[PDB]
Design a protein around this ligand. Structure first.
Ligand SMILES: *CC(=O)[C@H](CCCNC(=N)N)NC(=O)[C@H](Cc1ccccc1)NC(=O)[C@@H](Cc1ccccc1)NC(=O)CCOCC#C
Ligand SMILES: *CC(=O)[C@H](CCCNC(=N)N)NC(=O)[C@H](Cc1ccccc1)NC(=O)[C@@H](Cc1ccccc1)NC(=O)CCOCC#C
Lengths: 305, 300
């Protein structure tokens, strides 16, 4: 029993973290076989970030300008290229600790584990959801750029996030491993603000099922509703609309508890309309939306890797 | 910026996790040098747990009765002994992935990371606090026994917890790595109640400092309180007493925010009496008490 925000074991990714230095700028890189991936703005000075001409800045750089360090070992860069906002440094040495991996682009509402690193050394691991506004609410300090987010899909590390920046909001923005930003953000010092966010409704429902599995039932009522009626309420409280694909994804949790999804929707509607009655659910006094349906199944079923 | 419940990277512990089987009972063990540590009740049947005599149950066992698997490599057991509620299986090969480590016994209110494992393989990592009543509010399923809790310093892993059981209330109890249970619990299927739990006051204050650092200030007031006057209020809400040792521990955060500890105590006093006014702090509508002062420093 019990339910916590749980990250994937980080060992496989820890073995891939290196430090990348260009001039005065240091950050983290991901070392996979004989390529190191890192944010391309490592090549930029503070003055370059005002209006960086990345294609030109990279042309002026050579391999010797890139100091890659895997712990105490210096990796020799023998090639450098740019894929969108990610720099790819080919090195003399292939990482013997490279896990079976894939690069995937996640959708808003999906979660991943973040391995926060500094100077190529991992510092901590925690779970993040990709917010609907394409930011994440992370915990990052100076030098955390190049930290990566990932999932472990059965027998494969799926990298989905590389950290690039902190917005004035204090929330965080980055790219997939192909170097394409999540959301409308750019690696330049220009005006950037996260759009209006929303609550991930299917995740809230998944979390209520988790509570039921763990014995919490006070919020269950004898009512049911329609998908349309539920979505009229959800809109009023800045919740994302619930689709039939969302209902389908909740099927395993509805099966496990015997509570139909639209019954749970009726319970959530009442919680939205009248509050949580000064009670807590799985240690929270608010409705939590950073657990996916699969996160719930994984935790309550003991999936291993 | 930002503030999150963060676990230590689990790699160094992952490389120590193995599977221990005795008869039909399997669980996790911790392989350090040439010794595998695991809960001693791995030697019990479901029925033995009603009234076990571990000393006698262990005489019935041979080295061959213990199947230890590092993944799918069998580790030859060449010795077995019991230390309090932990079994120590001597194996014929030292773990090449043994980190620098120590066994430590932690106090209520201290935090640690848990690497939840099943059949010797890691499933997830999260952060826990040892509660004042010596339970932990974990996430553990059947087969999770032998999962360990730890802190990482330098690159030294300080192991502080090994999981043994879930109480009927859904909370969790275990031992240090010398086999001594935290709290008044025993590895026998008998009535054992956890004491009434209380809130870890020093951690709540540390977290309020974290919120100030991240911009939340609505709860700050200019009220003033004595340490004793504060403790009189906190005791009414089942908060742990705050001592001068706690005040000193919060010094580094009070220095950074320029907010005196007792002034932060005056904010906490008002939050306990009135409530939070339908507002939130660092994304929570409850007072969070599972961040130590050092967790707040390390993270910021
Ligand atoms: C993330 C990271 O570590 C590197 C710095 C690496 C070298 N320095 C150290 N190791 N100590 N990246 C940044 O610092 C990052 C670069 C950047 C700049 C502009 C756009 C994308 C990326 N800078 C930030 O994350 C700025 C982002 C920003 C963007 C537009 C306008 C202003 C600022 N965020 C902050 O510095 C934190 C405060 O955010 C609001 C402000 C200012
Ligand atoms: C922790 C662990 O994995 C093993 C499981 C045994 C082998 N592996 C698998 N089946 N995969 N240990 C237990 O499950 C554990 C053994 C035990 C029994 C008595 C005292 C200490 C340890 N049993 C539990 O954790 C019971 C503990 C208990 C103790 C006294 C009275 C009742 C129950 N807790 C639960 O099973 C949780 C369910 O709620 C109990 C209730 C109501």
């Amino acid at each position: 029993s019990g339910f916590r925000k749980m990250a994937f074991p980080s060992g496989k990714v820890e073995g891939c973290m290196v430090q990348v230095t260009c001039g005065t700028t240091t950050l983290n890189g991901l070392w996979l076989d004989d390529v190191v991936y890192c944010p391309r703005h490592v090549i930029c000075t503070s003055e370059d970030m005002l209006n960086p001409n990345y294609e030109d800045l990279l042309i002026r750089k050579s391999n010797h300008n890139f100091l890659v360090q895997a712990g105490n070992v210096q990796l020799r860069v023998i090639g450098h290229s740019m894929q969108n906002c990610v720099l790819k440094l080919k090195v003399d040495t292939a990482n013997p600790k490279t896990p079976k991996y894939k690069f995937v682009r996640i959708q808003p509402g999906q979660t991943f584990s973040v391995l926060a690193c500094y100077n190529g050394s991992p510092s901590g691991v925690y779970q993040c959801a990709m917010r609907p506004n394409f930011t994440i609410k992370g915990s990052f300090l100076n030098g955390s750029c190049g930290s990566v987010g990932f999932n472990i899909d059965y027998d494969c590390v799926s990298f989905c996030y590389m950290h690039h920046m902190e917005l004035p909001t204090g929330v965080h923005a980055g790219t997939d491993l192909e170097g394409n930003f999540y959301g409308p953000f750019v690696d330049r010092q220009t005006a950037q603000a996260a759009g209006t966010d929303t609550t991930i409704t299917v995740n809230v429902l998944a979390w209520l099922y988790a509570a039921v599995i763990n014995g919490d039932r006070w919020f269950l009522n004898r009512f049911t509703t329609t998908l349309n009626d539920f979505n009229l309420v959800a809109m009023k409280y800045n919740y994302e609309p619930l689709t039939q694909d969302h209902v389908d994804i909740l099927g395993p949790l509805s099966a496990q508890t015997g509570i139909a999804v639209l019954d749970m929707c009726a319970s959530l509607k009442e919680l939205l309309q009248n509050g949580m009655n000064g009670r807590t659910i799985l240690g929270s006094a608010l409705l939590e939306d950073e657990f996916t349906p699969f996160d719930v199944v994984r935790q309550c079923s003991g999936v291993t890797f």
